[PDB]
């Protein structure tokens, strides 16, 4: 009786939200950006090839200096690369080799990683002893660790396969805030540029917008038909793009609280592993299972170019803070740095 | 045309590669086994016989180092992290023979043996393990023999029309799992009957792993 009545009220609230979103859908993003000229064909060459990983690479993250990057592979090695020279700055042996994510601290003093061991390990890069050591192991998730992102040297947000995201205080090693509400495995998260909000995509085909300080879900974004594997904030923080296993990328708006554009092609029938934006946000770069990285026009949903330089699934990619280059990691154990030429 | 600091920076990188290449050779000569099974199916017993989120166990037998990964604690979707084990030497699958007349505690309608068959079918026919051999263990042999005297095997398999003896009932169950093999060309299944007091469980794995090593060597050398 009471349970039946309550679940009927949830359907009414969902219908109310759907009608509200449809009410403000006066125009389409395609119509708005029809007049602007296309970006043309985007041709990028492999400037650098980072060799040394001997197994599948699962994650990479640029440092804020746009020169150093950290990559994680399931050969049990975290490697820090000097992208300008391809020199290896550090090689961090992982206690657990089943790593799925890695993060570079914005200060550059720390890196983080974690996988099927359900632990987010923090590594100090600037020690008086001259070696990288584990400074913290963040335990508490009951599923695999899918993504992690530093807010600063003391705070990091992790998403897990136990359907929850958490905000951690690194100094005390405890999660100050727990973000619950996903009914499936959360596969990725992206921090807003001001680091006051973050979005997460899960395997329930939904994306939730979370308030970091308050600790509750502000908005929920649906529309995908399968698990969301990748998510990335727009450079101004008012939008984000997701990549799912249904071979589609969608651009959701925070303020309009609904999807604006879908980025898919008929030839593409494989899942999407990673997504990122260019510095201006005009280009959306997405990694795919078909060994390729497709460059999309974010505004016009046109495939601007293709990065085809890997012999296995492109598992991760990232764009520098200055927008100078894009790195792609892949299951073929190589990382490649791409940029165009005049 | 590099400065004195950059020359040491490049020299440092070569020092790192000498250690990464060294570890790659060591990690390629060790055996990585993925351990699967059902609840109370003897999967935990095998670890005790061959002594967070994932439990990893190491043991060396006859100059061969084995890495056995137990993923019983992962309650999330299997399909997300299953590809992380693409490339394991072999898969050890534990099935409880005695759990043929029992049912799942939660489902209360699905037979416990049929649950193992569905799990085996999802792993044997999995795309990531197309050419991965399976070392199928059928544990609880003694308990299965006692229960088959009172409880007929027809309850689990209605199509079974054989003698009510272990020598014929167990062989029928073994063929049922092997019949689930959707690719009888690229892989073989090594079926073994263990027990709570057996001591040849590790020996079977070593011989089964050796045949997998030989098969990979033949593929590399071009004979196969």
């Amino acid at each position, epitope marked *: 009786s009471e349970l039946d009545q309550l679940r009927q009220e949830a359907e009414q609230l969902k219908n109310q939200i759907r009608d509200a979103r449809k009410a403000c859908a006066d125009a389409t993003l395609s119509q708005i950006t029809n007049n602007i000229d296309p970006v043309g064909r985007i041709q990028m060459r492999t400037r650098r090839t980072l060799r040394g990983h001997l197994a599948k690479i699962y994650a990479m993250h640029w440092g804020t200096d746009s020169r150093l990057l950290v990559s994680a592979s399931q050969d049990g090695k975290l490697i820090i690369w000097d992208s300008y020279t391809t020199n290896k700055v550090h090689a961090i042996p992982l206690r657990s080799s089943w790593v799925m994510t890695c993060a570079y601290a914005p200060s550059g003093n720390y890196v983080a990683c974690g996988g099927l061991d359900n632990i987010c390990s923090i590594y100090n890069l600037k020690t008086r002893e*001259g070696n990288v050591r584990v400074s913290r192991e963040l335990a508490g998730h009951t599923g695999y660790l899918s993504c992690c992102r530093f807010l600063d040297d003391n705070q990091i947000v992790t998403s897990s396969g136990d359907t929850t995201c958490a905000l951690w205080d690194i100094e005390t090693g405890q999660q100050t805030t727990t973000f619950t509400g996903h009914t499936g495995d959360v596969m990725s998260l992206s921090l807003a540029p001001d680091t006051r909000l973050f979005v997460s995509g899960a395997c329930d085909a939904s994306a939730k917008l979370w308030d970091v300080r308050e600790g509750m879900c502000r908005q929920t974004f649906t529309g995908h038909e399968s698990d969301i594997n990748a998510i990335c904030f727009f450079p101004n923080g008012n939008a984000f793009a997701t990549g799912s296993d249904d071979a589609t990328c969608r651009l959701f708006d925070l303020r309009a609280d609904q999807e604006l554009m879908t980025y898919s092609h008929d030839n593409i029938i494989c899942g999407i592993t990673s997504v990122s934006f260019s510095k201006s946000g005009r280009l959306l770069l997405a990694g795919y299972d078909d060994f390729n990285c497709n460059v999309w026009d974010a505004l016009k949903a046109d495939r601007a170019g293709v990065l085809a330089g890997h012999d296995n699934r492109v598992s991760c990619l990232g764009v520098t803070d200055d927008g100078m280059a894009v790195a792609t990691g892949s299951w073929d154990s190589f990382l490649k740095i791409w940029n165009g030429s005049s | 045309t590099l*400065s*004195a*600091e950059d020359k040491a920076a490049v*020299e*440092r990188s070569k020092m790192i590669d000498r250690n990464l290449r060294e570890d790659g050779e060591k990690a390629a000569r060790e055996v990585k086994l993925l351990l699967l099974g059902a609840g109370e199916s003897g999967k935990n017993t095998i670890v005790k016989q061959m002594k967070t989120g994932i439990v990893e166990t190491h043991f060396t037998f006859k100059d061969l180092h084995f890495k056995m990964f137990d993923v019983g604690a992962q309650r999330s979707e299997r399909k997300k992290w299953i590809h992380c084990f693409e490339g394991v030497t072999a898969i050890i699958f534990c099935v409880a023979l005695s759990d043929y007349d029992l049912v799942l505690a939660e489902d209360e309608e699905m037979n416990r043996m049929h649950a193992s068959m569905k799990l085996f079918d999802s792993i044997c026919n999995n795309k990531w393990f197309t050419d991965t051999s399976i070392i199928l263990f059928l544990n609880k042999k003694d308990l299965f023999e006692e229960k088959i005297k009172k409880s007929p095997l027809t309850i689990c398999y209605p199509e079974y029309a054989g003698s009510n003896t272990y020598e014929e009932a167990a062989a029928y169950i073994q063929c049922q799992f092997e019949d689930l093999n959707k690719r009888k060309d690229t892989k073989e299944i090594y079926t073994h009957f263990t027990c709570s007091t057996d001591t040849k469980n590790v020996q079977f794995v070593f011989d089964a792993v050796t045949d997998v090593i030989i098969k990979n060597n033949l593929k590399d050398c071009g004979l196969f």
Partner: single-chain antibody
Amino acid sequence: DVQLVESGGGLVQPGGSRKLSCSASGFAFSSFGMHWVRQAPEKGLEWVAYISSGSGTIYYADTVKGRFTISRDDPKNTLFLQMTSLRSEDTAMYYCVRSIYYYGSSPFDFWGQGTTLTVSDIVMTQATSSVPVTPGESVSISCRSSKSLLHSNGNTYLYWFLQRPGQSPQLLIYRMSNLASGVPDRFSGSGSGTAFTLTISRLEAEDVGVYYCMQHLEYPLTFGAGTKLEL
């Protein structure tokens, strides 16, 4: 804690041989390149030798090449300097210096206490030998180089060290602008091309000492004469 203890120094006869050891504790010795730097009495700093991490690269100063041998024992974390045919010119305090080289590292950051030995090329110039100073006042120290220390990669390989009376040298500024870890922010390094300035805002009692500018563009590493601050 990070420690570097040198031993083996003492009074030796001319033409003799002596073996200097530098034992390292509290840090990953095998990850750091190691230098020996000496300072003649009432003179400036003088670089002696360098051995890289992994012992693959070895450099010597011209004045000692062929007579001195530098070696390391990574399992024992000991640095060695085998000396032969010792001359009266070799009378100096020999310092053990660690330096690690990767992008963003701070070479020459830690120096040993030194051992005393008594026997019975880019030019770095610090013309101003002494500067009378008062606490709380801003001081600038000038250094000059015969060659431009700015490399084509954007780095300017100039280092600043402070040797307080009775103490080992300490790194202040590495690559002409960066401030070493544990150094107060009042120190600032400014330069261009061949002319460099070290600015010390709000001078304190601890800052009193001799200041050396070193070039790291190429070997041999050469030091300036040094500028002393006195009250």
